[PDB]
Amino acid sequence: MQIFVKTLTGKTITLEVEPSDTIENVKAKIQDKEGIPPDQQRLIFAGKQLEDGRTLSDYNIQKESTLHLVLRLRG
Amino acid sequence: NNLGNTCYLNSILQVLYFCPGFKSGVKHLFNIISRKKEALLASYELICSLQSLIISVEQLQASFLLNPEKYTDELATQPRRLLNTLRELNPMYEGYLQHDAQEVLQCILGNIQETCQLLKKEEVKNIGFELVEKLFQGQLVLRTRCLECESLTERREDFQDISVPVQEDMKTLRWAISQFASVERIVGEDKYFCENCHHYTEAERSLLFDKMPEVITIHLKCFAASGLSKINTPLLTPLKLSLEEWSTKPTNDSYGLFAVVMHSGITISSGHYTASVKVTDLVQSLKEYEGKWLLFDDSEVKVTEEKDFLNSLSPSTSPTSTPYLLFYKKL
Amino acid sequence: RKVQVSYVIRDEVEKYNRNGVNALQLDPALNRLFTAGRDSIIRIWSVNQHKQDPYIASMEHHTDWVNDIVLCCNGKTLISASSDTTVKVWNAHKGFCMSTLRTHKDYVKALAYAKDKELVASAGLDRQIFLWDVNTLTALTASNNTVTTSSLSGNKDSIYSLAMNQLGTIIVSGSTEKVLRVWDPRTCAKLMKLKGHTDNVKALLLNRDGTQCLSGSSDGTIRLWSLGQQRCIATYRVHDEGVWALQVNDAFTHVYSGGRDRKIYCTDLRNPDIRVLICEEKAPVLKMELDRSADPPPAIWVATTKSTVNKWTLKGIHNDCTNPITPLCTQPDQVIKGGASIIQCHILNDKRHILTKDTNNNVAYWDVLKACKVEDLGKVDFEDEIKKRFKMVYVPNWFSVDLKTGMLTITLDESDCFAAWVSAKDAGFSSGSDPKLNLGGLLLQALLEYWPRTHVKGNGYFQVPPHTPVIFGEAGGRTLFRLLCRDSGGETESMLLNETVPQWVIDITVDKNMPKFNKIPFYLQPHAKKDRLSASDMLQVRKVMEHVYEKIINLEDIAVLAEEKIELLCQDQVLDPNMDLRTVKHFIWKSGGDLTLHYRQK
Ligand SMILES: COc1ncnc(C2CC2)c1-c1ncc2cnn(Cc3ccc(-c4nc(C(F)(F)F)cn4C(C)C)cc3)c2n1
Ligand SMILES: *NC[C@H](*)CS(C)(=O)=O
């Protein structure tokens, strides 16, 4: 299934993923395109942060769903 | 007070104290949980912890107004008990580390929303439960238009915050909301797979607002990959925001800026969070602060004029404390 | 970047269109229609009425949609542009490709022609326009001769249309930039930047002098431009939705317009209130081509998203209404038959068979490994036929399926091609052993068994059909090489395979060494002596039963005592003795973490 990810510049990228894909595999595919390490990445869908160790089916991520990519601003 | 690394939580608690209905909704939920406890969990400790924080704050505001000669130790005001409840709900808040203020806002709002859904399911087993859903929750319409077959597709997705770019790959906040919401062409490596064409095609993509909350939080992406870099230049922040341009229906609603959270630091890995808040509404001197701005350091409250605050925020002067969360309220 | 190996499951002769038609051309001297399909095949058709079968030939060397075709040099040469990023030169009289141009970076959407200069332009999604001399493009191969590139620059967004003046003096580009761009192709210079369209422009026309352009946008407008004044001179709103096809008579006075609304009009450009509805089509109009055998055009050919191409007769175009709703012709005068497109594919649990549903609502059963159809199931329910063919087996995914061409395309990548190990018995082969087979390996050895470099011939278990096209492409749709499975023995194909076959195919196919076995860890705990284990993903539960009976109970046939003495449990379900550890981990293990097994005595 194809999903959109809105990157740091607001630019949208496309990922091809499966409902059984874990959030860590999606963060690896975002590292492969945008070059950001998975430990610095932070995915938001439908106003909830996606937690590492869950599958895209647990969140109801379908075809044409959008993720927002953000980083931690530590303070 | 601070008591070590909690400036990320303090800034969020200070902006939530001045949100339109947050302080009354937390009192309604805490009174329900208190009636539950007298008639007979970790999520309920978050609402007990928030109520105990809010009561401490009204006791300070009263004590400053009528008895300055009291609370000499600042009564030990503590978010640390709330932080212990957030450790029980989320392992990341362990020790005296530094964290993202937006990630704490998401954790607090999500755990209050889960508590609201739990109390709603309990009551239905035998109206004020939609606290987060009225205040911070909105609904988008994500249109995609395949340039080969000109078929529209809609997705309807919820949002608590609007994450916007600060620079291109000076600017105004209208430009950042245009980059979030206006029509984007997806082309080259990121083609749309169109189920009507059975083919990868270019597409136009547009995001429109359909339901707006009473509080709009804009999450400024003050950070870019160059190995990661903080963007120190702000963009121009309007006092009044109108979203009719990216709206599914025309609406004569205007939103007014009432809180900001700033991050002072030259790197993404460390810094100091500060909040500043407009006082629109809640003994004579209490009303005199209206229209002004409160700036919260680690334990100082400084009253500042709206003009001086917006001059210091504008990119015309070196800001030294980058805006990170902007909160706009329905007028 | 990363080379993928693909192949297409098809019949030897794809006589009918298997998807929509993007481009049309006529040869009036030969009475010959060309149809460039989304099935990647350019077909040649006879348009004489006495011909019962219109089919003449098929020209098949693309790997994705053929977006535009140009007939050049008195119908001797055809130029084809595709979503495979290639522009191809063909012999139109014989039907073979005689050159391929790879100078684009993304899909090539539009061609232009200047008849009086033999000059062709190609444009695409890569924002590039290349100009070609057709007499120069008639070179056999890069080794016989290679050619230079003339480029027009200045487009800021993807080009969906070109138009070139017949005299090769003006070229026009229409793009998602919403502004028409004009150059002189002779000097490669800019002339103009016409503004006034509100969406993408898919149709462009020029008159013979290049003085007037006629343009159709997805905004539903047709604009007539005066290129002598850099402005629009008229606008016509006769479509409710986007205009995708335009044609004009030779006098440049009547416009035939069609688009997403499935209607064809003829508007007088001088008096646009007098229009006629020619016909109401069944699908969106993609391209139209006029019959130019008489002064008023007697017919129009209409290509759509459907696999049928229709001729509509234009006789009787004079009534009086400004927007007549009664079409002039309600039945086509000539119909080129089309086939059915595959529109759903479902890979079964063995990772070897597909169920496909087509446009006709027919379900078919396919074998990937042999690259053939097994049976046609008729108009059975697709979700019920999927449920009937459920098997309690797990095989790792090792190929992708694409339906872009309306026929099965199977793709293999290094990442997952080799992840499918299977027993010979489970894969339906036998000899008197149960050897362990890799499906991607056996398929790669069968796909190019005719390569002299791979002989010692084939995998020794199955052969693919000799007509099966084999494609070497990059992730992104850029094709490097295409051949048929039988053609790998030729000198030019053997050299292009030495220059194109990726090393991840050469290691298994040529060096004949075998891929990594996958191993899964598991814990073997007594059900209410503990260790963490690792074994092959395919290990039968019977060999875990043996290992428990011999390592925990070491105090007749030993394997019969092992299976009848020890039981295996996982998630409180007793395991089938014949289940592989893959299938246990995929179905019976819903809990997170490493697979845990428990055991007891019968
Ligand atoms: C964990 O800390 C918090 N968590 C949630 N919220 C809050 C603050 C309530 C936001 C805090 C918080 N942080 C830091 C401090 C420091 N001192 N205090 C008490 C306090 C709060 C507000 C004021 C005050 N209110 C007003 C008026 F706006 F009403 F007019 C004027 N003034 C001033 C200008 C005289 C006076 C004193 C703090 N409280
Ligand atoms: N990033 C945590 C806030 C800074 S401090 C000095 O208040 O701990």
Ligand SMILES: [Zn+2]
């Ligand atoms: Zn489409």
